[model samples]
Target: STQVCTGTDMKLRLPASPETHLDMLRHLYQGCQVVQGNLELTYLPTNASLSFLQDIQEVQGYVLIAHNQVRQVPLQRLRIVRGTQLFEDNYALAVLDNGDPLPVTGASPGGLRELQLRSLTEILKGGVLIQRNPQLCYQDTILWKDIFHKNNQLALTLIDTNRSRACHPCSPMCKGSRCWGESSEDCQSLTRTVCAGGCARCKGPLPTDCCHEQCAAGCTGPKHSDCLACLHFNHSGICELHCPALVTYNTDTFESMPNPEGRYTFGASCVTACPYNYLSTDVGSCTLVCPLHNQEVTAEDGTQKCEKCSKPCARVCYGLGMEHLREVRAVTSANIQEFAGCKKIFGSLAFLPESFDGDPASNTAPLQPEQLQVFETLEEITGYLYISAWPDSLPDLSVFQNLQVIRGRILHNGAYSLTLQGLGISWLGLRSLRELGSGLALIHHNTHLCFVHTVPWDQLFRNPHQALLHTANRPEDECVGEGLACHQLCAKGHCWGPGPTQCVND
Candidate 1:
């Protein structure tokens, strides 16, 4: 053993000459903690092991392990490398098992197999380049997380390496290899062979076998099978296979029996019958059983019970009174469910004080923010839209922010059509509305509702008179120049407001 210790950086090559000794490399650097220069391992012997460098903690320069035929490189105590860590073009290298004895103070051991960088926490001034190793099984354990967390900005390259399958549907068993079987016996044999040393049952479709443990009662076949009837009482038995007599399996213990009286298994014993309000075709299933048109079933507690829908706005409005159908109000998040299935309202849409309650004196609540998001999905309206008797200005129509087309008419009823009878609504975010179908835009007694002063009437409506009737909500004057007065103005030679100032040039 030649002892030459120079405090500065030094280079040590294994097998100094063709006839040099093999153990010479191991004895050269026994007690060194840090390598000041690059440590290159090339053309190593087939059975050679780097167990000699087990005490090394850090490498100040690059650590290159390339073209070596070593089966396993045991860099057991390495933690940090100030320069690049490159492992490239090693054809026969199978395992890079960095064993126990971590270098860092608080580093925990990463329980990885085949390739273990247990204590390696960081590469301060360099990147980790690992490529062209065909048999390397890079298991993404805590070791990888620590490395990426410390140097996320570094170029950590991992290409052409045999990394372990990160996402294997048939886990714990059928991993690191393809799962395929034609029959139950074939699946079982394949699983036993692929998932060796473990007892796993195979199942699922061909070309992909789902390997799982045997049930409490032994599996019926090689494929994935549950416990047979009376096998394990608490275990859920195969309903179609084991329960041929229409008997219900016990959810609590190993008791196999049918339900008593008119009750039967609707999937299980506990969930046997439907509520009095609901109609079930049979006692065994909830497939044909459903609530009425204006009703919905609530099964949160595992009991199928029916309740009257407060807002039945789907294909038909069944329980809504005549007065309630004509005008709706205070449409908060609670009441919005009434229009759950209503793609188009058959009657007029009214926003009045009497909408929520029949009494006009009662205060109507504004729509909630969540209710606005719910209304964003409403695409069209077949009836007319009326706005009046609101206690305050309508909430921002951001609820109808995504409204693309208005098929119905716009009817404003109040004291002053412009101001909406003191209901101060400055903006209605209906910017995406392209078409206002065949319906009158009747603007009446609205004091602050300024249709002519705000919106582009001519560009949005083909026939201005047919769409705009009251409150001087005309095209030319209301949609004059741009800016605060009007955001979108009518095209030149197409003005239709109150004044004779018709065709204003763009």
Candidate 2:
């Protein structure tokens, strides 16, 4: 037996106000299994108020109250019905002005029935203001819960306390007044700076101290506009200039001066120059040499030039254009016999084929038991070998491309003996290097390696120093020899010192 209570025009006259209408609905909704009707009341007030209809536990039912007038309800007043007790054609209805009723779609009676009373209380607390009323005073309970769950449902549209504005604070880049607080007064003094991915222009109490964005490599100045124009800038906002010479200007005359170069067009400042030329040549003294030699020189007085090969032969070598035989060898105790083709001799395995086979032509004779099989044949043919430590007698000398071995005695020697010497051999113009992973050499634990010419070491080598500084600023420990060493030994006319104590004065 269903006890259905349908309110009629007679009941609509009680208490008269919109608040009393909500109260009447709440009162009539209790204990009754089914409650339906539109009480035709007079004078629906303009003031804001909370409205709600409770659910009957276990029974597939719902309570709906709809306004027939041309009035708008605050979002706080509109509640999403939650529950799943009934499926389609279930017990929920919206009343119309013509006295007809429309059934609420997607109503779940079983699901809705389980909703806690506290949740129901929360739904009504958010103020249901029909319009702005300064005198309106009604306790809003649902809004308290909305404010409580603000962070969780940050993106949900909400009705402000004033009821005039409706918006969502969900944007990742939201930098407007909504982020300041609910009060519009909070945004009055707010100056917003917005960026993608939650970046915001933050305003500080101090005027001069503001946000300075990060720039990529080759970026020339503070403003992002300046960085974008610089060719040196990389994707990361960092710029790798061929030469890191500072570009300066006279404060009074606005005359631009870049290190050795006095001044130039803004167009010329963008050009990259070689590191060595940057150090040796007087700044701004660069001359344009006609490659054909027939044309006259057009020297830009204030421009710097990238390092390029000159015609004379003395300065050029393997790295630039010529070829010289150089070798590297690795000595390890791991049984070369197991590696089979390469055998272990001096507690190290030799990878050279002839050395493993003990061939005469492949080795330097009079080998000591500790001397691993000579990889000379491999060095001569392939021009490459690996070694463990830099030679002790001339640890510093080991930087030469002609390095032969790294034995235990090398470490026993002092630091000066181990320091590398000579510029050694160079192997520049080998196009076949494409097969050999050209321009991909690396040195480890050896920091003294500076580019004789300001080369794009970062691009050429696997690991390069992040910042370049004056030669004096180079780390002292950088001279420790544990990696590929390059030296111009024969060209320099110097020999490897006897031990670590020997020092060479530049």
Candidate 3:
């Protein structure tokens, strides 16, 4: 466990640039033990020095540069101390180096904002740091704390002073029995007054404050309106007797109030001069309009709505039965039912919907559920079925007679010996498919299906051995393909080729 780093006392003479020094250092430290510390290169160019500095951070040790002509050290990025020395010419600058002014003042100045100083300290402590820019002192530190503290204090004060403001029928704005406008001299000194519920006295014909009592003219919600007092009311109409027209017509719209000087009572007739009130009738139905993209254009009779265009569907592949589709190319649940008939479909078959004949984009989404068929059992399937689902679904030993061509993967279920007879198999169980009749029935790659593994094919065939395996008999035996010889594939030993020679394991 060697950790190599550059040494502070190391020197690189002229012409041997920092690059040259780095190459040498890397070579020297290649397989050594820990070398923790900085390697101060005194005379390298800025670019070369920066590169060396970056690489050296990985090395071990403290680096120091002695009497060199270099000025302006990039102390901003340095972890260890960097300083420039100006000794008397007679002091043999290299031999008795002393009194070096801290180079480039990497240390934060006292006047620096607290954050800047903290950042500088972090670099000095060999911390993992980035972004050396200054942050606003008051905004980052003082302002945040001040605002937070003020909000906290305001909340506490609101909680403490809330009970004192309760009116006769105490509620959100109420205090004790006295209404906010009580004439007592002591009440004159009070800066805050409470109204029952949230009601306040009206300041003008048009409420300057909302009512605070139960059944109070401008009272809004929650507590009973009769408990409301005068102080909480804004300058809306007060007693029903004072403003009969307003009282009779007022309805809580929570609508934007018209300009303060132009009082418009709720439910009042609309003005003919208003922009939207051409009919001079206020009580009219409000029409709803939606954004163009989301708008649904409906017939005037409200019977039908227009359908929107469909977007491109995501790409997906049809799955084999639960056993057939491989994990990587599996389709989603949405596309499952629509392409069920395509289960175990091989890579060779191309499926194009009828819609594709005219416009390709018309078939933008996955096939619908009605378009798919589920072959839960191989009894319902024909041809070369790819093993989309698992191999456990092979039909019973009766249905293989009609199967002629297949093109997909068939995973074998078990080891079996096979017997081939004229045109049909006799005992075609899985345990009997291990051999071929004579030198024929070879398990070479079939042109249509990739491999000739009988394990998967036997599952589809009834009396699998006789239907699949056969040998030359009566010379006119058309049971097997031409020029091919078939024989009983014995389970106990290897199936042989010509001359009945047993196959030897390689």
Measured by lDDT, the strongest candidate is 1
Best-to-worst ranking by lDDT: 1, 2, 3
Question: Can you write out model 2's per-residue Cα lDDT over 1-506, one digit (the tens) per residue?
Answer: 22333232232222312333334433433343322222222233323232322333111122222322313222221122221111122322222221112155463111110011221211111112122221111112123332221122222222223322233332343333223223222221221222223312223334332223432111223344433222222222333333334457689997866665333212113233422112113332222221221222114651224233344322211110002211223222322222222211111222232232343554533223334323221111111222223322232322222223221111101100011222121211111111110111222233333332222223322111111112221232443233222343323322223222221212
For model 1, residues 1-506, the per-residue Cα lDDT tens digits are: 11111011111233222222223334334565555334545445555657766666555455655445554556655554545333232111112322221174464323122333343444444455544443344332212322332223553544344433232222234333322211111111122223333433223333234233422112244433442111111123332322223355688985868645334332222233532222333223333223333233436643433344446634443212123544433343335567664544433444555443344344434444354355566555533444554434353354554455554322221101111222345444454555554333444444444333334554555332223444422233433332224323445423222222222234
RMSD of 3: 34.7
- Point out the worst 10-residue segment of candidate 3 by lDDT: 116-125
Local distance difference test, each candidate:
0.37, 0.25, 0.24
TM-score of 3: 0.14
The predicted structure with the larger TM-score, 2 or 3, is: 2
Q: Global lDDT for candidate 2?
A: 0.25
TM-score top scorer: 1
- Name the TM-score of candidate 1: 0.26
Model 1, position 95: C-alpha lDDT score: 24
The number of residue pairs in model 1 that clash at the backbone is 27
Which stretches of model 3 miss by more than 4 angstroms?
Answer: 1-8, 11-19, 25-38, 46-49, 55-62, 66-506
